[PDB]
Amino acid sequence: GSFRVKPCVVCKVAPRDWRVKNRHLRIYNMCKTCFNNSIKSGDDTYHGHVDWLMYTDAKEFSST
Numbered sequence: 001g002s003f004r005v006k007p008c009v010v011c012k013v014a015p016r017d018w019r020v021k022n023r024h025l026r027i028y029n030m031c032k033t034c035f036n037n038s039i040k041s042g043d044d045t046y047h048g049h050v051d052w053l054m055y056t057d058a059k060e061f062s063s064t
């Protein structure tokens with residue numbers, strides 16, 4: 001069933017919104033709902049996304 005992926009937690013009912021970046025796939029650390037809420041609750045946390053390339057995977061969390 002599950003693997004090594006990491007789904008949302010604020011909802012635990014959703015994986016994590018995703019977007020497409022030129023040949024690459026962009027995932028988010030929080031779903032669209034919790035994402036907006038993250039702005040509320042999170043304000044400045046859990047803010048992170050993962051980009052997948054047609055060859056390698058990447059992470060872009062703590063950017064500051």
Ligand SMILES: Nc1ncnc2c1ncn2[C@@H]1O[C@H](COP(=O)(O)OP(=O)(O)OP(=O)(O)O)[C@@H](O)[C@H]1O
Nearest residue numbers: 017028029030031032035046047048049060061063
């Ligand atoms: N739902 C989310 N969950 C967690 N973090 C998010 C979420 N959405 C945005 N972020 C944070 O804000 C940034 C994402 O904004 P994003 O870069 O995807 O807009 P963009 O339009 O795709 O960028 P660009 O304009 O260069 O294409 C990331 O650094 C990420 O950490």
Ligand SMILES: [Zn+2]
Nearest residue numbers: 008011031034
């Ligand atoms: Zn969520």
